[PDB]
Amino acid sequence: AEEFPVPNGFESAYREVDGVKLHYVKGGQGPLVMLVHGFGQTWYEWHQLMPELAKRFTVIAPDLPGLGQSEPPKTGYSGEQVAVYLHKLARQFSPDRPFDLVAHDIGIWNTYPMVVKNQADIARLVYMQAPIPDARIYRFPAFTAQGESLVWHFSFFAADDRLAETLIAGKERFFLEHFIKSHASNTEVFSERLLDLYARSYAKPHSLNASFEYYRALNESVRQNAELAKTRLQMPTMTLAGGGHGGMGTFQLEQMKAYAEDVEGHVLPGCGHWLPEECAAPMNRLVIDFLSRGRH
Amino acid sequence: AEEFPVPNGFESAYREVDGVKLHYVKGGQGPLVMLVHGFGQTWYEWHQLMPELAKRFTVIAPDLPGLGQSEPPKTGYSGEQVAVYLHKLARQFSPDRPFDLVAHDIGIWNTYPMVVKNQADIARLVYMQAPIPDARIYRFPAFTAQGESLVWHFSFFAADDRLAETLIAGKERFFLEHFIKSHASNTEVFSERLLDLYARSYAKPHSLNASFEYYRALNESVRQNAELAKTRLQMPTMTLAGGGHGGMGTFQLEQMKAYAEDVEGHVLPGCGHWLPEECAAPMNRLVIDFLSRGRHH
Numbered sequence: 042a043e044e045f046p047v048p049n050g051f052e053s054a055y056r057e058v059d060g061v062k063l064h065y066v067k068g069g070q071g072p073l074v075m076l077v078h079g080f081g082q083t084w085y086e087w088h089q090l091m092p093e094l095a096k097r098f099t100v101i102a103p104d105l106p107g108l109g110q111s112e113p114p115k116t117g118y119s120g121e122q123v124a125v126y127l128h129k130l131a132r133q134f135s136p137d138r139p140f141d142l143v144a145h146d147i148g149i150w151n152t153y154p155m156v157v158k159n160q161a162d163i164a165r166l167v168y169m170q171a172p173i174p175d176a177r178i179y180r181f182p183a184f185t186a187q188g189e190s191l192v193w194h195f196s197f198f199a200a201d202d203r204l205a206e207t208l209i210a211g212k213e214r215f216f217l218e219h220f221i222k223s224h225a226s227n228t229e230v231f232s233e234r235l236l237d238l239y240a241r242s243y244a245k246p247h248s249l250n251a252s253f254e255y256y257r258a259l260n261e262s263v264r265q266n267a268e269l270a271k272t273r274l275q276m277p278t279m280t281l282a283g284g285g286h287g288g289m290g291t292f293q294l295e296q297m298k299a300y301a302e303d304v305e306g307h308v309l310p311g312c313g314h315w316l317p318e319e320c321a322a323p324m325n326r327l328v329i330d331f332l333s334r335g336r337h
Numbered sequence: 338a339e340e341f342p343v344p345n346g347f348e349s350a351y352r353e354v355d356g357v358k359l360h361y362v363k364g365g366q367g368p369l370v371m372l373v374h375g376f377g378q379t380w381y382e383w384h385q386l387m388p389e390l391a392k393r394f395t396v397i398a399p400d401l402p403g404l405g406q407s408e409p410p411k412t413g414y415s416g417e418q419v420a421v422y423l424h425k426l427a428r429q430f431s432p433d434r435p436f437d438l439v440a441h442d443i444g445i446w447n448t449y450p451m452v453v454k455n456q457a458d459i460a461r462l463v464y465m466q467a468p469i470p471d472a473r474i475y476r477f478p479a480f481t482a483q484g485e486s487l488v489w490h491f492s493f494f495a496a497d498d499r500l501a502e503t504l505i506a507g508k509e510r511f512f513l514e515h516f517i518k519s520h521a522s523n524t525e526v527f528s529e530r531l532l533d534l535y536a537r538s539y540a541k542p543h544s545l546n547a548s549f550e551y552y553r554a555l556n557e558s559v560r561q562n563a564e565l566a567k568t569r570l571q572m573p574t575m576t577l578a579g580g581g582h583g584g585m586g587t588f589q590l591e592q593m594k595a596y597a598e599d600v601e602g603h604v605l606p607g608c609g610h611w612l613p614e615e616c617a618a619p620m621n622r623l624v625i626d627f628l629s630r631g632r633h634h
Contacts, residue, residue: 182476182479184555186475189495195480195489196481196485196486208508259480
């Protein structure tokens with residue numbers, strides 16, 4: 042059964058990539074755009090953008106390895122390892138043209154290495170609401186004068202003893218509602234049904250573990266990216282970030298300036314971390330307009 | 338009933354202070370020293386040091402409000418509120434003479450206001466393994482390249498919706514073994530038997546909640562101390578910190594220099610956060626020697 046409802050004109054499907062069965066939802070015609078979700082979510086976070094984008098592009102939205110309906114990786118959870126799966130999956134559908142890439146939260150972690158190593162394959166790039174793993178993440182504070190900080194969960198999720206799985210099992214719905222709303226400006230967009238669907242998905246034991254294995258590999262990803270970042274990104278890039286509670290603010294664009302020669306950025310006031318849901322309409326417009334400057 | 342075994346010659350007792358029943362263990366003779374435990378623990382963390390100190394001092398080790406066998410505070414959990422209870426308790430047993438103070442972890446938070454507001458009541462001071470609440474705590478990292486972030490649990494414990502109690506209830510023994518060992522260098526001293534004792538105490542629902550209310554009041558304590566720290570501490574002070582995994586390192590002394598005119602500091606190599614248990618012999622020696630510079634039995 043499908044964990045989330047598939048939009049009209051799209052298909053839910055699977056492809057084996059290096060022995061790992063990846064789930065994705067695909068529709069549209071034209072050059073390929075791959076949309077990569079982040080923590081706590083699945084392909085479904087893109088379900089409002091996908092039909093609009095499908096008017097000019099072939100759109101594919103995979104579930105990250107181990108999350109949604111995708112099998113766990115058989116290599117590992119570091120950015121370079123996961124990016125192989127996403128790169129090869131995209132190339133099955135766009136072998137002869139470069140494709141566009143849009144990524145949210147840890148979707149950035151899981152795609153940056155294949156972008157930087159296969160630049161001729163990437164037409165345009167959109168990154169939103171997460172640092173690329175590098176030394177800048179070691180500067181975020183553990184605690185703020187207003188209470189809990191933006192990324193203390195990096196340490197919670199990366200802790201050993203399966204600390205996060207053990208404390209959250211049996212409380213998956215409670216924890217996901219807290220985490221989503223603590224990083225949101227607009228909490229009203231998260232209906233009880235929507236939270237039910239996301240919680241059901243990541244409560245699968247292999248998905249709950251997969252969720253935190255991305256963070257247990259974060260320092261390895263930082264170390265990997267320290268070598269990769271010697272090559273600058275040359276393709277047109279756009280960053281988006283929330284300006285409200287939970288948002289990265291100016292950090293997203295300022296970090297990307299060190300990685301990309303050709304980058305434009307927007308900060309969305311009144312929006313937090315969950316841009317495709319909290320601020321669906323303006324986020325959709327900025328992405329569509331940015332991608333539609335290319336051939337379509 | 339007693340949650341932890343009382344050392345031979347000591348008594349476990351209770352004293353009502355401003356409507357709150359405080360548990361403490363007391364023994365010895367001579368000038369008073371009060372030992373104040375921190376998070377995850379109770380008076381019992383001092384149980385190896387207490388018999389040695391009691392040869393020269395009257396020793397009292399209270400349970401912080403809401404923890405161990407002490408009732409929760411009635412005012413609040415900010416450092417200035419809790420310090421009233423501890424100051425009044427100490428002065429019940431030393432009403433006409435200054436007393437010594439040793440504090441670990443959030444025992445610092447819960448004593449610093451009464452030290453700075455009643456300086457003539459404190460003869461000598463020993464602080465170990467925690468920042469005094471001030472703006473420096475906003476500078477610690479959420480995530481580190483090596484090891485683990487020392488204070489990311491500040492945000493976890495301070496989070497609203499009772500996040501920490503809701504996740505940890507029923508899993509207190511698992512969580513306490515993880516938190517203690519992740520902040521330790523010499524993990525082998527935390528036997529399953531010792532962890533069982535500590536976990537049973539803080540698993541009492543009101544103690545689990547009290548544990549996190551100290552962190553939910555931390556920003557209030559920072560704001561309080563911004564005013565209080567306009568007067569430096571004048572009495573002899575010593576800081577201790579672990580140099581190993583989980584230790585504060587040089588931060589403990591460096592911050593204390595901003596608070597105290599007369600301070601000496603030690604970093605204990607190969608020791609983490611839990612100095613009384615991980616490094617009992619050097620820590621006990623440092624504390625006994627420092628306090629014995631003052632008059633004693």
